[PDB]
Symmetry: C2
């Protein structure tokens, strides 16, 4: 699963500025796509080169330039093809879990802190996903399949947060 | 978190053959590190080049060469530094969720199919992780922090499986 595919997805229904695409990817869709920093800009560049999207540079007095991206016919074709494709294995790499797995030396304080910091991360993600669920629902935009993904995401966050809470409780 | 960090983790305690490192990576640690295949061999080459591990080629009559890898002092230092570093954000990319999120066109059949297949994938991951838990425990090799990671992994698989089962039930 590539950044290019989720970006075409984001651009399927609307022309969007880079700001808006980044907002969607970082703040809305991160419960199912959270990769490495700085994927978006090189990937937008390649999608443009490959003719899957267009880029418009909007100039305004006294403001930074704004880039507006729009899917092309070929881009829509590529998205449609991708959604017809066999599902790829999920990718999951948890640094937190790695630290605990290889955490023989961790003293009690260091371990306790790692657990608390991860609990806070889960709380932040739950809050954000919960807030988007509410807004999407309020706006009448949430589709039934989207609803499933949110229920899935929340369950994921809450179940693992609970494990850590239960650990801290002893 | 990079492939090189987990491989150093694997090599911290024991010298291991490439076969064994791969077995650990693919069949033991996949619950917190499941990335794009084809990482291990290029990563071992780079680690050796950078002096963080050694490679020993054991030649035997009538068998393929066996490669044995061992962490070096500089390697141990690199691992120590890594484990002291701030925890990185988890990477999580679900093609399954992406399909449902952008799955406006899915007919009831194709949707149900995707869900059933994702349930199966989760059942398998649960089996593998549960199996390793029991083995490690009986062997006396399961550390307290490792057990936390396993409980965390199982909760994540079971809670999301549960959401999908309840969806199919409706």
């Amino acid at each position: 699963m590539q950044g290019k595919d989720i970006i075409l997805g984001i651009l399927s229904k609307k022309e969007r500025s880079g700001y808006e695409i980044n907002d969607i990817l970082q703040n809305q869709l991160s419960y199912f796509y959270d990769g490495t920093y700085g994927m978006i800009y090189p990937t937008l560049r390649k999608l443009e080169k490959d003719g899957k999207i267009t880029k418009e540079v909007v100039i305004q007095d006294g403001r930074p330039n704004k880039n507006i991206y729009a899917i092309t016919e070929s881009g829509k074709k590529e998205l449609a093809s991708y959604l017809q494709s066999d599902v790829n294995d999920e990718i999951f790499k948890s640094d937190f879990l790695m630290r605990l797995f290889f955490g023989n030396s961790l003293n009690d304080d260091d371990l306790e802190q790692l657990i608390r910091e991860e609990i806070e991360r889960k709380e932040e993600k739950i809050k954000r996903l919960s807030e988007n669920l509410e807004i999407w629902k309020k706006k009448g935009e949430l589709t039934p399949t989207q609803e499933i993904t949110i229920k899935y995401g929340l369950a994921q966050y809450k179940s693992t947060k609970k494990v850590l809470e239960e650990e801290l409780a002893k």
